[PDB]
């Protein structure tokens, strides 16, 4: 699918697409226009993704998706540059599975024929412990590889249970380059390579994976007959991002009636705690796990207060939280749910930051609890903002924190609603940004 590369960037991305997998009415198909046949095997599963559903692959022979490149499409051939892109979600590997499977390199996406004795020519995406590997292999047997070594801090890592957007460009005259979320993260020279004769199938499946429990998710798998440049990559990545659905920490759609641990984006090493029922919330340091021998550490998740989002007007609709929804926020404490809000004339700081209260119950005192869940900033981050309203549709502010002291308690970062944030919404970091972290099988603390 050739192009004049002086074209507008959107046009470049659209017409250089040789292959593009989409899921519609639970059927994986090629929407590129070249109509390559896609075969979904029984145990290829579908999970929530970045837009609609995603492919979910588990470790057995029936969990696979195969693309028969339609008759004849060529994108590698001989010295033809190409790019592959996909959203990827890999569970955080436990310390257990690391030191017993660290050395097991297994492919997840590949155009190489797999024989019992050898592999043969093509390209492959593979995982080896906390490494993401891109391999090119020519018909004469020469190989070039990028080995992306993921960072040790798994709260901020790319192969640790969040949806991330992968793009790998191949300039046969220079290098292969690996981008994650539009940022260059690895590279290798590939100049020596000869002809790449790949299979006529692209196979999405865990191949040679010794861990029975391993799985991955993949979405928007896409192939371009060009080596994309950084501007095109940046446009491609942001073309997938939208505010319509709010996101949990993993990148999945936010949901009503679901327990979430709250973490402030600006103080990611902190948890939210409750002083007491009917009183205020504040931040504390979260505990952490460190294993130098295995090259990993992280603040532990699922400590601190659990929150639940409910529809403000039950309205019967699905369970997805959309940006702009009116919600009620509850804390789950001692097997009960307690409303979050601000009492009329309740305690507040001198700057009018309103101190939030949990389960406040004074009879005859109005409790302002109407919130709007919104995405006002930082589209690339899976964070949400919450706007609190009084009884007259006036803004009491975004939920955030205020460093202060109440009574003789220690000095604390106390949860508040503040209108200050609205003059500051383009700032780099703000305390009105929250992660909503649900428990997930892809992250267990060691």
């Amino acid at each position, epitope marked *: 699918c050739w192009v004049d590369n002086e074209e507008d960037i959107d046009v470049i991305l659209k017409k250089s697409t040789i292959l593009n997998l989409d899921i519609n009415n639970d059927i994986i198909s090629d929407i590129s226009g070249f109509n390559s046949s896609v075969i979904t095997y029984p145990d290829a599963q579908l999970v929530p993704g970045i837009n609609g559903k995603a492919i979910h692959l588990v470790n057995n022979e029936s969990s696979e998706v195969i693309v028969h490149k339609a008759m004849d499409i060529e994108y590698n051939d001989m010295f033809n540059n190409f790019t592959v892109s996909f959203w990827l979600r890999v569970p955080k590997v436990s310390a257990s599975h690391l030191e017993q499977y660290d050395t097991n390199e297994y492919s997840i996406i590949s155009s190489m024929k797999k024989y019992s004795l050898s592999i043969g020519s093509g390209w492959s995406v593979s995982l080896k412990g906390n490494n993401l590997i891109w391999t090119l292999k020519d018909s004469a047997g020469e190989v070039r590889q990028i080995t992306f070594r993921d960072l040790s801090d798994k709260f901020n890592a790319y192969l640790a249970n969040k949806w991330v957007f992968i793009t790998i460009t191949n300039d046969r005259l220079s290098s292969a380059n690996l981008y994650i979320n539009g940022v260059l993260m690895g590279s290798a020279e590939i100049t020596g390579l000869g002809a790449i004769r790949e299979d006529n199938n692209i196979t999405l499946k865990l191949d040679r994976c010794n861990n029975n429990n391993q799985y991955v998710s993949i979405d928007k798998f896409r192939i371009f007959c060009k080596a994309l440049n950084p501007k095109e990559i940046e446009k491609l990545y942001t073309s997938y991002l939208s505010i319509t659905f709010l996101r949990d920490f993993w990148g999945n759609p936010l949901r009503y009636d679901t327990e979430y641990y709250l973490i402030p984006v600006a103080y990611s090493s902190k948890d939210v705690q409750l002083k007491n029922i009917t009183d205020y919330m504040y931040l504390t340091n979260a505990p952490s796990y460190t294993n130098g021998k295995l090259n990993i550490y992280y603040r532990r998740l699922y400590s601190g207060l659990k929150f639940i989002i409910k529809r403000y007007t039950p309205n019967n609709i699905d369970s997805f939280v959309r940006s702009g929804d009116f919600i009620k926020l509850y804390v789950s404490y001692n097997n009960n749910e307690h409303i979050v809000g601000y009492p009329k004339d309740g305690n507040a700081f001198n700057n*009018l930051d309103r101190i939030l209260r949990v389960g406040y119950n004074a009879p005859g005192i109005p409790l302002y609890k109407k919130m709007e869940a919104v995405k006002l900033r930082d589209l690339k981050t899976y964070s949400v903002q919450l706007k609190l309203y009084d009884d007259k549709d006036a803004s009491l502010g975004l939920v955030g924190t205020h460093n202060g002291q109440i009574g003789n308690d220690p000095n604390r970062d106390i949860l508040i609603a503040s209108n*200050w944030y609205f003059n500051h919404l383009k700032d780099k970091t703000l305390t009105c940004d929250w992660y909503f972290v649900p428990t997930d099988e892809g992250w267990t603390n060691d």
Partner: antibody
Amino acid sequence: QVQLQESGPGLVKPSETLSLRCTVSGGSISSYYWSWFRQPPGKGLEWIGYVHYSGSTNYNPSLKSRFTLSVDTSKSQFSLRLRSVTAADTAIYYCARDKYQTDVSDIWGQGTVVTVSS
Amino acid sequence: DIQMTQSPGTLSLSPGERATLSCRASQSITSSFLAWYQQKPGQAPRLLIYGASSRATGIPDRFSGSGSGTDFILTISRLEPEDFAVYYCQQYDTSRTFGQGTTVEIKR
């Protein structure tokens, strides 16, 4: 006992670029928001913009992106740049520290007089 | 874009008298992000009131702020000699803008 001291050229010719600095003493840039204001002779106060150690800035929209604020934490300074100055830019320029989690300013410098003329 | 109109333009009073300064915004400031500054000749402004009614640190108790919506008031309960100056209101709800100032001068 935090003190702010503006410094700049007293006089600037029209169409040049004006550069001003504020030096913080008895304290540091830290995580405060830092603002510039100006007051033309006999004419009252105007907010120009803020700057923050993260590099975040914001401006009075009616000043049409003629100003650029910047900061250097290593020198405990922040600065203002104003392009293509006109006689209407003659004023006293003030630097100030914004109050924590407010957009009011509670610590001010003495101001620096800027005259733009040929 | 919010404009503020202060009245009166000039206030002529004696020490010991009550001073009421008014500020009217072109739109409702539902946040109550309205502040008051004092400026004497040749000096930088001085924050008096913020959040419409909170006194800044170190400000004497004779200064109080009140009001809501579009109408805000600075009161000086009993003028002292050092209080004759210009007073500016500032909204910091949508960007930051000032009124044109009210002068408090000595009546004779």
